[PDB]
Design a protein around this ligand. Structure first.
Ligand SMILES: CC(C)C[C@H](N)C(=O)OP(=O)(O)OC[C@H]1O[C@@H](n2cnc3c(N)ncnc32)[C@H](O)[C@@H]1O
Ligand SMILES: Nc1ncnc2c1ncn2[C@@H]1O[C@H](COP(=O)(O)OP(=O)(O)OP(=O)(O)O)[C@@H](O)[C@H]1O
Ligand SMILES: [Mg+2]
Ligand SMILES: [Zn+2]
Length: 870
């Protein structure tokens, strides 16, 4: 054994040993219990940083723990390769997005290989390869003919100067990001997944996910946004019907989740596009100006909760069907034409939005709910005004005194008897719009024929291959300017036709890649039946909370679609979910000549303290704040530079030790140093042990006759094994597991293990320590193991707990009656004061000197004495 720890030498050797043994290349082996651990695959945008590394080290820790316990572990990696990163680089470096993507994949793969993750690289997928995306093109065509995928006009952000569609993230105060031109709201045909048809299933199946963080489930529930409410129709008054046609001349229909407050409605409000708004605005130019300002605004809910709610009265009136009140119709900018009826009722006394609205315009507030003895001040809003659970109705005639659910059910029966309303369920969830007007994405497998319409490409003709010899420039999608791509024949009639040139939302690739890993070379379907049946569901998923809503919802949706197609037989894709905390790091920059400032990477700066200078120009730089490690502020620490300086094991150890996995983790030079020093200590410990006599048979079995100090070391040892097993398996708290092993080594260091029995216990401790830590730092542990023991580490398995090592020795306690010694008892070291009392009262000499008299008091001195006063 070499005396000094040399990571640069032993880590490549360990990785080659693991690669040669194929321990991470797994099949569908029925002779082993399966375990599928999955980390969210990265966008191949250039270079991974230590943030990504924390995510993938956590998954590798869990994967190696399960492997040591005899599981058939699949831990796959792959590349979420489509999307805008490459398209921007194509404009920047004037390179094809495909070529840029593959160059990044190759570099990042070596980044990952250098870290020694136990990954099945034979299952690697890159989602921009036709062999992958053909199968989501396939599922698209199957769902299209079922109507689950459909085509309809939707609204987009049209930049007339750049001649491109833009996301809402790129429209700023109504103008494009790179243009500043007024964006036009344009209606174009697009493709949608009818995810609303699955809303109730997607909502209710969250209850099955007993091992998901509650916040993630809460966020999905709020996103789906189911509500149980009431459709309510207000008869349009006879004087308010001019210019109204059909049903709009008859009633105003609204949706409310508070039908128990319908007796308290004081006005109603309609969207600017509502037919009542249009008719009243006919002769009123003030109503036209307000309607125009509404439609010109952004309907995004982010801008709308921060929006000043405004309205104008219309002079039109409707009649409350429960009490006959004549209520004026207002046009209001908060009423959305597309959610429900585009019209709402207003109850200012019991909804905070209606209270503030009616406080601005001095509209009536009528109390219909009392909550105990709480006083109702019509000029101030109180949190109990909206309490659904603890209130009963007042000023409601038939309904007085009922609670929320009783009044709900009563108003439902009343309105249905009058034909003026009925219960209705709504969802905030909208259908999922697939279409993107971008080049670097999966082509939509639709052909447009003037005779046959929008027809799907037949399964025999899939994939529609995205051409990779393309350099986009930002003046519209290049597919729309390539007749060699879009000119084709119609698959139904054979006539001349045109391919759809929009591509798919790249969330599509990530909505099913976890099934593709199960059979990534299968060419008869998305996932082979035998492999899906073997691997079942992902046992463990690890990824950032930024994907807890959309990605997770889409993946759960695809799972159910694939189930209903007969491709898989699980309802849910991910059984356990771990959301790792973000790695954060200080930033640095300097102001550029073009006004705006540009950011400098940490490893390119030099910091002196008690000046911050650029490591190249030797000029000082700005030392700004600490935030999430990312490419935007260029504060990503490249693992490869850390590995060159300290080794992969030092990188993995720092990430797993510095913080609980869910807690944010601040980059620290001192923290990296503390990990290396521990690895030196670990190496030093095994070397000095083998120096002083060489390897021996590890102690096992009956420990009677072992010295007190060695019994205590074995007690610490097997307590540590139980603890680390619980931290890895149940708690998933890796920082405390490492601390536990460090405590074992501290006690080892304080124990004389020179004797024959001392060496056997020393062998037992070190053999356990190196296996306990192997999921965290497998390179040094693999090498140290082989110097300790000739068996294969993965065949020796996870360390077992010796329960006999956890039994402490028994105590002898004196039993006195009225202070005079009358007997002796033998008690457990863990015996409570009540067990000491019981054993003492049952001592022969105690009962023979208590003379049947009861005990007036019993003094218990643990470990020394029990005195029975009688
Ligand atoms: C399933 C797909 C939709 C996933 C998509 N391709 C994606 O998110 O890919 P991306 O490459 O962006 O990130 C890959 C993983 O790394 C995590 N991550 C990134 N930065 C940090 C950081 N500073 N600290 C901690 N963790 C971080 C991030 O949460 C994610 O789980
Ligand atoms: N088109 C619409 N635009 C704006 N608000 C609407 C629209 N349709 C209904 N509403 C209002 O939204 C209220 C509640 O609907 P929803 O469940 O979507 O929201 P919420 O705030 O989550 O629910 P709640 O008020 O019960 O807590 C209804 O009572 C109604 O007054
Ligand atoms: Mg269950
Ligand atoms: Zn045709």
């Amino acid at each position: 054994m070499q005396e000094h720890y040399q990571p640069a030498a032993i880590e490549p050797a360990a990785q080659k040993k693991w690669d040669d043994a194929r321990i991470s290349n797994v099949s569908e082996d029925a002779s082993k219990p399966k375990y599928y651990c999955l980390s969210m695959f990265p966008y191949p945008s250039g270079k991974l940083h230590m943030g990504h590394v924390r995510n993938y080290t956590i998954g590798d820790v869990l994967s190696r723990f399960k492997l040591l316990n005899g599981f058939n572990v699949m831990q796959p990696m792959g590349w979420d390769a489509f999307g805008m990163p490459a398209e921007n680089a194509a404009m920047k470096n004037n390179v094809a997005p495909a070529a840029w993507t593959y160059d990044n994949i190759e570099y990042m793969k070596t980044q990952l290989k250098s870290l020694g993750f136990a990954v099945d690289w034979e299952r690697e997928v890159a989602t921009c390869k036709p062999e992958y995306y053909r199968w989501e093109q396939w599922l698209f065509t199957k769902l299209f003919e079922k109507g689950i995928v459909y085509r309809k006009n939707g609204t987009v952000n049209w930049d007339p100067v750049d001649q491109t569609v833009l996301a809402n993230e790129q429209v700023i105060d109504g103008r494009g990001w790179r243009s500043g031109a007024l964006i036009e709201k344009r209606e174009i045909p697009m493709y949608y997944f009818k995810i609303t048809d699955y809303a109730e299933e997607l909502l209710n199946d969250l209850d099955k996910l007993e091992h998901w963080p509650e916040q993630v489930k809460t966020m999905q529930r709020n996103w789906i946004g189911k509500s149980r409410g009431m459709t309510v129709r207000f008869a349009v008054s006879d004087d308010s019907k001019q210019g109204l046609e059909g049903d709009y001349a008859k009633f105003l229909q609204v949706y409310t989740t508070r039908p128990d407050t319908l007796m308290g409605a004081t006005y109603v409000a309609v969207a600017a596009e509502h037919p009542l708004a249009t008719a009243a605005a006919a002769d009123k130019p003030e109503l036209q100006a307000f309607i125009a300002e509404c439609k010109a605004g952004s309907v995004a809910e982010a801008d709308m909760a921060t929006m000043e709610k405004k309205g104008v009265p219309t002079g039109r009136y409707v009649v409350n069907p429960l009490n006959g009140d004549k209520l004026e119709v207002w046009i209001a900018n908060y009423v959305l034409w597309g959610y429900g009826d585009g019209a709402v009722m207003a109850v200012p006394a019991h909804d905070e939005r209606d209270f503030e609205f009616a406080a601005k315009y001095n509209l009536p507030k009528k109390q219909v709910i009392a909550v105990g003895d709480n006083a109702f001040d019509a000029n101030r809003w109180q949190e109990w005004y909206g309490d659904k659970e603890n209130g009963v109705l007042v000023n409601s005639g038939d309904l007085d005194g009922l609670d929320f659910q009783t009044a709900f059910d009563a108003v439902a029966a009343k309105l249905q008897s009058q034909g003026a309303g009925e219960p209705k369920t709504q969802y905030r969830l909208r259908d999922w719009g697939i279409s993107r007007q971008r080049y670097w994405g999966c082509p939509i497998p639709i052909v447009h024929c003037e005779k046959c319409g929008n027809v799907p490409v037949p399964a025999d003709q899939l994939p529609v291959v995205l051409p990779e010899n393309v350099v986009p420039d930002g003046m519209g999608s290049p597919l729309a300017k390539m007749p060699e791509f879009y000119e084709t024949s119609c698959p139904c009639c054979g006539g001349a036709a045109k391919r759809e040139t929009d591509t798919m939302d790249t969330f599509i690739e990530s909505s099913w890649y976890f099934f593709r890993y199960m059979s990534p070379k299968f060419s008869d379907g998305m996932v082979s039946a035998e492999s899906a049946k073997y691997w079942g569901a992902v046992d463990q998923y690890i990824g950032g909370i930024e994907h807890a809503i959309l990605h997770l919802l889409y993946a759960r949706f695809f799972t159910k679609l694939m189930r209903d197609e007969g491709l898989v037989n699980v309802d849910e894709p991910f059984e356990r979910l771990l959301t790792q905390g973000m790695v954060v790091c200080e930033t640095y920059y300097r102001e550029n000549d073009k006004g705006g400032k540009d950011w400098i990477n940490p490893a390119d700066v030099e910091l002196t303290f008690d000046s911050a200078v650029l490591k190249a120009d030797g000029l000082p730089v700005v030392i700004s704040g600490t935030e999430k490690m990312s490419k935007s502020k260029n504060n990503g620490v490249d693992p490869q530079e850390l590995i060159n300086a300290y080794g992969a094991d030092t990188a993995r150890l720092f990430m797993m030790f510095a913080a609980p996995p869910e807690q944010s983790l601040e980059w620290s030079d001192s923290g990296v140093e503390g990990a290396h020093r521990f690895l030196r200590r670990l190496w030093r410990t095994v070397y000095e042990y083998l120096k002083q006599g060489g390897a021996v048979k590890a102690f096992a079995g009956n420990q009677d006759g072992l010295s007190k100090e060695l019994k205590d070391l074995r007690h610490k040892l097997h307590s540590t094994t139980a603890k680390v097993s619980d931290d890895y398996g149940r708690r998933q708290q890796f920082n405390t597991a490492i601390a536990a092993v460090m405590e074992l080594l501290n006690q080892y260091d304080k124990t004389d293990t020179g004797s024959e029995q001392g060496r056997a216990v020393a062998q037992e401790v070190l053999e356990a320590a190196v296996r306990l830590l192997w999921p965290i730092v497998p390179h040094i542990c693999e090498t140290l193991w082989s110097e300790l023991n000739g068996a294969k580490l993965w065949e020796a398995g996870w360390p077992t707990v010796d329960e006999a090592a956890l039994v402490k020795s028994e105590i002898e306690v004196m039993v006195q009656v009225n202070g005079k010694l009358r007997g002796k008892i033998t008690v457990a070291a863990d015996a409570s004061k009540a067990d000491l009392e019981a054993a003492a009262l049952a001592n022969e000499g105690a009962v023979k000197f208590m003379e049947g008299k009861p005990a007036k008091k019993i003094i218990v001195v643990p470990g020394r004495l029990v005195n029975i006063v009688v």
